[PDB]
Amino acid sequence: STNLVKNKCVNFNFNGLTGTGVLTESNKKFLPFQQFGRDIADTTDAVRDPQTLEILDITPCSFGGVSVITPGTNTSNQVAVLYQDVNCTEV
Amino acid sequence: DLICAQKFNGLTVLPPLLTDEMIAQYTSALLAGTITSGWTFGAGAALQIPFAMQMAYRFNGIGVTQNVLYENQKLIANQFNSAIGKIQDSLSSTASALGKLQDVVNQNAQALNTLVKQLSSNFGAISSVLNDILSRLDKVEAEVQIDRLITGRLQSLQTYVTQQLIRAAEIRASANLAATKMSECVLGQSKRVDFCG
Numbered sequence: 302s303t304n305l306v307k308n309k310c311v312n313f314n315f316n317g318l319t320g321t322g323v324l325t326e327s328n329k330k331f332l333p334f335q336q337f338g339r340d341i342a343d344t345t346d347a348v349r350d351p352q353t354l355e356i357l358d359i360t361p362c363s364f365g366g367v368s369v370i371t372p373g374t375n376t377s378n379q380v381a382v383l384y385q386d387v388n389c390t391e392v
Numbered sequence: 393d394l395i396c397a398q399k400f401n402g403l404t405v406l407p408p409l410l411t412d413e414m415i416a417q418y419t420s421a422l423l424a425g426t427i428t429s430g431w432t433f434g435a436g437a438a439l440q441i442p443f444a445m446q447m448a449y450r451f452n453g454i455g456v457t458q459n460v461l462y463e464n465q466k467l468i469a470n471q472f473n474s475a476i477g478k479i480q481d482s483l484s485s486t487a488s489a490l491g492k493l494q495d496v497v498n499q500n501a502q503a504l505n506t507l508v509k510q511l512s513s514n515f516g517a518i519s520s521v522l523n524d525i526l527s528r529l530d531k532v533e534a535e536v537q538i539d540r541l542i543t544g545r546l547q548s549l550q551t552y553v554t555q556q557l558i559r560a561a562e563i564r565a566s567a568n569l570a571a572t573k574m575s576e577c578v579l580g581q582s583k584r585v586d587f588c589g
């Protein structure tokens with residue numbers, strides 16, 4: 302059993318269920334016997350911590366297309382990179 | 393959410409270059425130009441003209457001599473104003489009139505969904521989880537299986553992609569029609585019959 306990671310990209314296993322995501326506190330409310338939550342897409346959206354019952358979201362770590370914004374290489378060698386659809390930390 | 397699972401498999405939904413607040417400036421400008429300036433802003437510098445005169449033209453466009461409008465102006469006002477009020481009642485309870493739009497939004501999320509579900513299909517391979525084939529078998533076998541995954545998924549993309557291209561052109565022709573109406577109907581007065589309704 303390994304210490305749980307909160308608000309940080311982590312590989313994980315819960316009860317044999319495996320994946321990689323960002324585990325957070327979540328207010329969605331299970332029925333007691335239940336284990337997983339799931340989303341429309343049959344992904345594993347939300348799981349419950351076995352040792353301390355709590356509803357933990359799973360958001361896989363953000364990713365996006367790098368976009369290199371440049372004027373023509375004619376005018377400059379300088380580029381401004383756009384990381385698409387991420388909050389600015391993971392830089 | 394639907395976007396979240398999509399966002400999670402490599403499916404990203406880039407932002408439309410023009411935000412709705414921007415579109416609402418254009419559809420304000422065109423709409424504010426047509427009111428004051430007549431149609432002349434499509435052909436050049438907008439020309440302030442009394443609106444009640446602008447109609448005295450747009451009747452000559454339909455063959456009705458303008459002496460009808462200055463005389464019937466009031467009666468035409470209420471007929472216009474009331475006919476506006478009917479529109480807002482229709483939309484208030486009409487889900488269907490937007491069916492054209494609602495269908496387009498649907499069909500994309502549809503094929504988007506189906507694209508996602510194809511990640512759960514065996515495609516003949518022993519499982520639809522990538523790693524669970526690995527850790528079960530020694531890789532020289534997995535090289536064989538992961539084919540039937542890739543061969544499956546790669547196909548399922550080319551299905552989805554080739555769809556979008558076709559569907560894109562369908563919007564493409566519709567977008568061309570919108571430009572044609574925007575150009576001719578709004579910025580002009582269309583002599584074409586039943587093109588503007």
Ligand SMILES: *[C@@H]1O[C@H](CO)[C@@H](O[C@@H]2O[C@H](CO)[C@@H](O)[C@H](O)[C@H]2NC(C)=O)[C@H](O)[C@H]1NC(C)=O
Pocket residue numbers: 467470471
């Ligand atoms: C043209 O039709 C309109 C109705 O569409 C007539 O306007 C109505 O006239 C009656 C009087 O008979 C009024 O009670 C209504 O209030 C009017 N309606 C509106 C919207 O103002 C108009 O009289 C007709 N004119 C001719 C020459 O036939």
Ligand SMILES: *[C@@H]1O[C@H](CO)[C@@H](O)[C@H](O)[C@H]1NC(C)=O
Pocket residue numbers: 373375376
């Ligand atoms: C690109 O560089 C050429 C000279 O190499 C110059 O003539 C031209 O104006 C430049 N283009 C732009 C857009 O600055």
Ligand SMILES: *[C@@H]1O[C@H](CO)[C@@H](O)[C@H](O)[C@H]1NC(C)=O
Pocket residue numbers: 387388389
């Ligand atoms: C990014 O995270 C900060 C806190 O770390 C938060 O204030 C901000 O709203 C977040 N923005 C997005 C787009 O996630």
